[PDB]
Enzyme design. Structure first.
Site, mmCIF file in Angstrom:
data_model
loop_
_atom_site.group_PDB
_atom_site.id
_atom_site.type_symbol
_atom_site.label_atom_id
_atom_site.label_comp_id
_atom_site.label_asym_id
_atom_site.label_seq_id
_atom_site.Cartn_x
_atom_site.Cartn_y
_atom_site.Cartn_z
ATOM 1 N N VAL A 1 0.822 -1.197 0.000
ATOM 2 C CA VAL A 1 0.000 0.000 0.000
ATOM 3 C C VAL A 1 0.861 1.253 0.000
ATOM 4 O O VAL A 1 0.971 1.933 -1.023
ATOM 5 C CB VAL A 1 -0.974 0.048 1.224
ATOM 6 C CG1 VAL A 1 -1.676 1.419 1.301
ATOM 7 C CG2 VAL A 1 -2.017 -1.034 1.125
ATOM 8 N N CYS A 2 1.506 1.538 1.127
ATOM 9 C CA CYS A 2 2.299 2.752 1.230
ATOM 10 C C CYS A 2 3.512 2.840 0.341
ATOM 11 O O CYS A 2 4.016 3.937 0.114
ATOM 12 C CB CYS A 2 2.628 3.071 2.675
ATOM 13 S SG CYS A 2 1.120 3.196 3.641
#
EC number: 4.-.-.-
Lengths: 204, 204, 204, 204, 204, 204, 204, 204
Positions: F116-117
């Site tokens: 995600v990040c």
């Protein structure tokens, strides 16, 4: 308290049980490159320390196959008991006679498979009063379950679980007894140690 | 020293506990292909050695499911105790009666799950004075923690932890007693051994 | 021989030690989804079997964090000992008093970390004469080494290593005592069992 | 029952055996980042609790290499026995003298390799009547087999297998004795705990 | 360069293929507690983001079993295609018609077994022009080889391999859109996050 | 053929995304001691090579927690974007503006969680024309499935998967540019290298 | 987009390369019980779907050994090319002529070792224009590195990595074509499926 | 389709990069016994096939250490480039000049660490138009993440990932070219093959 029953190079015999060409294919709990090195390390230490050594095989004229050539070549004068039927080597009269003829109280045992060819005679020997030391990294079997079950069974009976490097160190006791000799054994069987030697040697 | 309490084909009974279709889905500590082979290997050795065998199931008319067909088919005349409620088979009077009726001092036990259906009766049997041998590779459970915790508990009580190949070898004692028979059992349950046989057979 | 010292639902208390929000982040020897399910399974079985339960926490007003909400909510009337300093719960006088007040000889213990919050009071309790049962799959720690070292230490002292499903089965003894109740506990905490139930239920 | 023989910060000495630069390359059973942290954690706790500490090395002027700088720097006044030949530190007279001079009944031992430099003196010390505690996560060896074989051997003899965090907790007993000090030790050696502290600290 | 083809909550449909009670017993590449949590997490996020969802089963009136109850209960109005024979769901006309009726370009797919029930329709859909996103942690199979081979095959075709948490974050885009909602989803399916929440909440 | 797009210390920026105290508890695919060392190694190399570095966090005033103290302390003048809601940092205008203001074509990215990040901004950046290098050993996530799926997705898009030591060597190019500096970085973050240095130094 | 190049039972041939008794001992990346089951499953599906099958061996009259008996017995009329020296089967003229004589565009390949006996002819076949499908779970090699490197190489060239169950399902397409037949194949080679069948059958 | 770019013993050179005594201690992704065997196997095959071989080292007069003795001894006349600072061997002018002087289009590369000493020159060589073959089992690094990330990077660029046995077989093509020679190479580096040979030889 509990006495430290340690290996004595003058009171120990080595029993190499069924390290046969065919049987080695059944060994999957220890990968082959490591297993081969460990078995050869054990043979080399037995020779280095001059310990009476006994070789034995099970139905070698069949699928089990011949004893790996290295051992045969390394111990040409050692008792060689080709068992035609007895699974537990201790059930073979010639085998027990050879073991007792060494006159040694301590038995260093390794072989394949761990839970049969090593465990059976280890348990029999313990009942007979011998101090048994199992070389767990020079003994092989199907998988971790067959191995660990055997360890539990042998330990439960009083067998001391050891590994080849530990065996060599307990036997040698002191580097000064012969530095080059022990160093050679280690360098030949421990890549990491050989590397340390290489760096140290080129620098000094 | 500690006596080697080894399996005696004339003084051993086999207890197969809850190897049921539904319950086998709970077994994840030993992969299915290996587990199936091992359970069938145990059944085959029980039959081969002619050991009195006892089958038992837990609430088979429910999610637990029926006993795997192979065992049912292999031991059609063996005592079959479908326990309607008792989790520990030893708590079932018919089960204990069947076990004692075999007249055997040694009990070879396997089943699912390891920490309940195997451990509970194993511990009960040890208290009753039986010599118990647990087939750890023919018993299954959720994971390595549930398995190893059970091993510790059974070993602590005096159970001998063994695996099927080891069980067969300790029972047989000598190849010469029937080479072809043991060889067939091994070939049918150890791909590596079967391969050694194939090569040896085509060459000789 | 060795008596089978089995859990008795009328003579057992459950000690849940330091299953705190912050401390659970330190648990890496058992993955979180499985660990959460197991801890909740243990709480559910304690409630189901109506076993006197004792909750305790260590410096909860700090990094350690509060007791996970589920346990607090499930045992609102249980003794809750927030230890301000004692690492071994047994060193806390209120804790020991609560344990002894249950009047139970058997103690089912679980918590975090395994080698400290579980092992210390387990060892203390064994010295005091209690029969201790450690729930190894509902206790968590840093890694397999910290875990296995603790298992060895607790087993060495006489603790019986068990897992939650085994604990539930030994306590229940017989399905007929309450089929639906036990089935619900299993279905809620064993996806594989729930699946067997689903298939069986839709078919019958 | 079995007494809980727990670490007493006033009756314990720490023996750090052969944590040498060259020898650390042989450690493969515990990954290096974790191993380094654990060894330093042990040194820090020995210093924190003010436990008499003994350093020893084996043939440091060779491939084995010098003692890792951190330990040397941390215990400048501690007995430092550079063994020129004895593999088992207990066979070195100066080493045993230093150990006995601490006047401590409990010995916390760690080093490399686990099955030789830790096990040999651990077994010797047990025979001499000392209460031995092995720090299994601050001791390193070739692989899991060499490690587990050693654990079995040491446990069999009566050694208590512990890990550094457990050692620190058993020694400290109570947070209130010095919260900041213990918290600092934990924060410096447990990333997960440090993170809990960071969040708690910025919020409060 | 290569465009970032990201999930758009207004142009994505979810296809849940064959998560049946019987078929889940075949899933061994992902352990059951984690797998159950992940499948339920995907169902929860599909419901949360109001994505058109299609349920499908293969020979549910047989060993394969019924759809797990939770999915049926969660999507009572979703198209439910019970396929009587077509292995690849894309070969079932009702299934494809339903997928196309959603009007969505992006297809989030998960199911069991990953190399058949997920891979086949994913490959078919890619050929048809759809943007396929496979939820690898909510899809299950026999082992890592059957899984990784499928990943390779799907990725080779252009499928984007994602996992449920990533799927949720890519769809949500911004916390501020609904903090509590996303937080609840995370709290219900990630024990570590729930613990962070518990500590934060009790402190603030 | 395919050009070797290598890191250029004068055309690279470092993006450290969400290495927060709370979020690090979710990282279980890489063990904590190694992960901490790797993240700090990346921070050290970014500082060593004077690369423009951008720090960013997601909802730091909540369960996610503050940025780990070391990064904050190491880059006091670096852009620090506290994102109040945008999950993909590239969706935050200040973040993108900062990245573009560095004037660097190459972006070295690391963060938590990797899928995600790290993955989201990496994919966004690739679309925008940047040369993306992902530091896979300084990025953390739930497990190997969430990690490997992300690797596949990022690699599929054209991101170059690298690890911190490789990043350092590709940036440095030649030891002679500053031997002591690079040696110190390595010594501080690779215990094995530090040991090599210790032995070499004491000998020379 | 990318077309789904799926197995067509009327345009596929099966190539079984070097599944010899001796060579199988070299297979250690997949355990023997599973490997044997998978190879026999592939042979069974090839026979079931009536696919033209080609058997080939390498230096069978030597250590490599004979073809495993089951394959020979199952395909008595299939082309059997005993290669006296060509390592890559595609370099053997009879082998290529046989492959081309089948008239099939799709080639399902499996053998030992995967990086040589499978990879070489797969790469050769791809160059020649064939659609290659590698059965990764019925192909064996030394370890995961030799295996994964081969997967990478084969996939890079365009080979589709599949596993036996997936192969069977892609070929079959629809259960209704012959439910009992496919069910039998599955039951004989997937213990979990067989268990599902047993429970379902006894209940219905 | 995609051409099978296979190793040609007359158009291939071998590059052995930084297999130094010190640097080998950093290799932990492949265990030492296997790694040593594989590196020596690659050296043996390079000598056997008479391939132009280039040896190179990085800062050998420092912690990195000297080239392992076996390679130096095996290739006494091979170009030996001791790089005083260039990390990527391709940045060293003598190194590139030597590679180009071989006149070989194909480059078989192995070394330590895989993501730096192998990957950097492999990527450089690919850019220059060479056909690169990486020997993944004779190249070593920190762990599986540093290894797999490098594989991804190298494969992405077009490098062919191979392993030593595959390299030997692709170069040899036909056993008949020299049976004894290839057999000896295999026997010396594959314990399982050696065992097959022993059994076959003693029988015939």
């Amino acid at each position: 308290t509990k006495p430290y029953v340690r290996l004595d190079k003058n009171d120990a015999a080595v029993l190499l049980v069924d390290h046969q060409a065919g049987l080695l294919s059944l060994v999957r709990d220890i990968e082959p490159d490591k297993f081969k090195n460990n078995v050869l390390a054990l043979g080399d230490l037995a020779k280095y320390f001059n310990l009476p050594t006994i070789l034995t095989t099970s139905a070698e004229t069949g699928p089990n196959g011949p004893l790996v050539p290295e051992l045969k070549a390394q111990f040409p004068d050692a008792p060689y008991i080709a068992r035609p039927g007895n699974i537990n080597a201790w059930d073979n009269e010639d085998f027990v006679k050879a073991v007792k003829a060494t006159g040694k109280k301590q038995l260093i045992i390794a072989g394949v498979v761990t839970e049969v060819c090593v465990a059976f005679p280890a348990l029999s020997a313990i009942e007979e009063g011998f101090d048994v030391f199992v070389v767990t990294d020079a003994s092989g079997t199907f998988n971790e379950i067959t191995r660990h079950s055997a360890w539990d069974r042998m330990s439960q009976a009083g067998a001391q679980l050891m590994t080849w490097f530990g065996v060599a160190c307990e036997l040698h006791r002191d580097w000064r007894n012969d530095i080059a000799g022990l160093a050679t054994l280690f360098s030949n069987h421990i890549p990491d140690y050989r590397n340390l030697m290489t760096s140290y040697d080129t620098l000094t």
